[PDB]
Write a protein that binds this DNA or RNA. Structure first.
Length: 96
RNA sequence: GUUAAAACUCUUCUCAUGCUGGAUUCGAAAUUAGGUGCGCUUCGCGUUU
């Protein structure tokens, strides 16, 4: 399973952002921090390599990608960061 | 057939707080409820000395 490399560069997808921690009585920012994210609509690519292919391989990978599309990829997954869509193409190679 | 293989920099944390689309300027300038139509028609200051 190759790393999901991006198609674009740092200056075109990666932005720094103010994340916050607010008190529940004063309703003002207690702690501020600066975290980097990737903008939405950013196209990443990877290439999965299943050798010795069983019949329940592409379906299982697609099922796992749907589980990743709803839970998220990366970190800070519970606060809403990481929801993506996956588009999938497949190819067997026989002779070179 | 790689000192391999195996192991997701993961979890926790709201860009929030403070700031009123406010200030100035008159629906008023022009236009006569005017024009037409007769309080008229009928009845003697009698009678009585």
């Amino acid at each position: 399973v190759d790393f999901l490399i991006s198609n674009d560069t740092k200056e075109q997808i990666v932005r720094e952002s103010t994340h916050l921690r607010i008190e529940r009585q004063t309703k003002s920012a207690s702690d501020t921090f600066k975290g980097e994210e990737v903008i939405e609509g950013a196209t990443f690519t990877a290439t999965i390599t299943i050798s010795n292919p069983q019949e329940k391989d592409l379906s299982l990978i697609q099922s796992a990608l749907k589980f990743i599309e709803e839970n998220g990829i990366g970190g800070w997954l519970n606060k809403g960061y990481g929801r993506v869509s996956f588009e999938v193409k497949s190819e067997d190679v026989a002779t070179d």
